[PDB]
């Protein structure tokens, strides 16, 4: 913009999971990008370049981090998939906020489910917070702005 916005003020909301204020707060969000797979072809007589063709649109997994929370609803949802193969996909909204705490821009993440859950190593000789990490697979996203 004339002065572009910073990246440290944002909100993560879930649809299909009971809401709690402690499940909307995160330390970091990553994975909001996309790419197109292509193929190459050489045409006889054309020596200046090879041709390139698109094939598929590709998205990476969405990664969320925060300090450990013991009564999380999101984690209970993750456990049902992890332990029993019960899968029930959800939708999600990522919001980048302005100074009035209203959205500048949002991302609509469609049909997501859990593929990973972990907690970082313990160390008796270091002063650190216990950090939890969750990774989700999804089909695509759209933006609103």
């Amino acid at each position: 913009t004339y002065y572009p916005p910073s990246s440290f003020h944002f909100l993560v909301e879930f649809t299909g999971i009971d809401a709690k204020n402690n499940d909307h707060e995160f330390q970091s969000v990553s994975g909001l990008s996309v790419d197109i797979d292509t193929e190459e072809f050489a045409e006889g007589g054309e020596n200046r370049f090879k041709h390139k063709f698109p094939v598929k649109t590709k998205y990476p997994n969405l990664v969320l981090k925060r300090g450990v929370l013991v009564d999380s609803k999101v984690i209970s949802w993750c456990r049902d998939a992890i332990e029993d193969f019960e899968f029930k996909p959800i939708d999600l909204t990522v919001k980048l906020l302005n100074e009035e705490h209203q959205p500048l821009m949002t991302w609509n993440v469609v049909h997501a489910y859990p593929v990973k859950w972990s907690v970082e190593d313990f160390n008796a000789q270091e002063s650190k917070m216990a950090i939890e990490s969750v990774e989700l697979s999804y089909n695509y996203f759209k933006t609103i702005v």
Partner: protein
């Protein structure tokens, strides 16, 4: 309805004209194949004598066609639009086999098949199938399987002669344009210039060495016995 994702269908038929449907004989897939493939073969006769540098190549036959594709069955619960079933993929595979594989006691054979998806339309017979079962519930109910298929091509014999409109055996007519001569036109119709006096007698022409440029002529076929 451009925006609709069309799904591949297979219907079973009772007769060789494809007009009498088998009752409850239609299969619709839930996931489309990635690709499909065709095969075409033409056979020639290539006998030659010793001492020569090249062979006279004679047409012999056009061989039947072939279509191949792969399918995936899955009822795990991550694909949008579908529900998880109590028995998984058991009824999906049993209905698929009843359409394409099973023997029909009314006709003493398996079924005629029509395969349609978008621009594709193919009639024929199943030749080969392999089904491999991949995931299971703890009590042994399958929830994922993969199938490979090969289809042959069927043409009814009355339709083959209508598509091969086989024509010195039939009758012909032309109109005379300026620049035409009678022995050159006879060569292009019969393969030989020597029949020009029989074409002129069948049309009542006396001055055949000069043709007038609006005349319609007939070209009779050659006699057989």
């Amino acid at each position: 309805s451009e925006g609709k994702l069309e799904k591949l269908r297979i219907v079973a038929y009772k007769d060789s004209k494809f007009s009498d449907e088998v009752e409850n004989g239609e299969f619709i897939t839930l996931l489309n194949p990635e690709k499909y493939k065709f095969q075409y073969r033409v056979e020639q006769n290539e006998d030659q004598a010793s001492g020569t540098s090249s062979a006279p190549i004679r047409f012999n036959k056009i061989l039947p066609q072939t279509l191949e594709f792969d399918f995936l069955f899955d009822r795990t619960g991550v694909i949008a639009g579908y529900e998880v079933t109590e028995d998984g993929i058991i009824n999906d595979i049993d209905h698929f086999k009843k359409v394409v594989y099973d023997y029909n006691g009314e006709k003493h054979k398996p079924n005629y098949l029509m395969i349609t998806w978008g621009s594709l339309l193919f009639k024929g017979y199943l030749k080969e199938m392999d089904i491999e079962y991949k995931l299971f519930r703890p009590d042994g109910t399958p929830i994922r399987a993969m199938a490979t298929t090969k289809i042959g091509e069927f043409v009814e014999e009355e339709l083959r002669t209508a598509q091969e409109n086989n024509q010195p055996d039939m009758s012909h007519y032309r109109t005379v344009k300026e620049g035409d001569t009678l022995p050159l036109m006879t060569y292009r119709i019969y393969g030989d210039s020597k029949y020009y006096l029989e074409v002129a007698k069948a049309n009542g022409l006396t001055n055949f060495r000069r043709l007038k440029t609006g005349t319609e002529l007939i070209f009779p076929p050659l006699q057989k016995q």
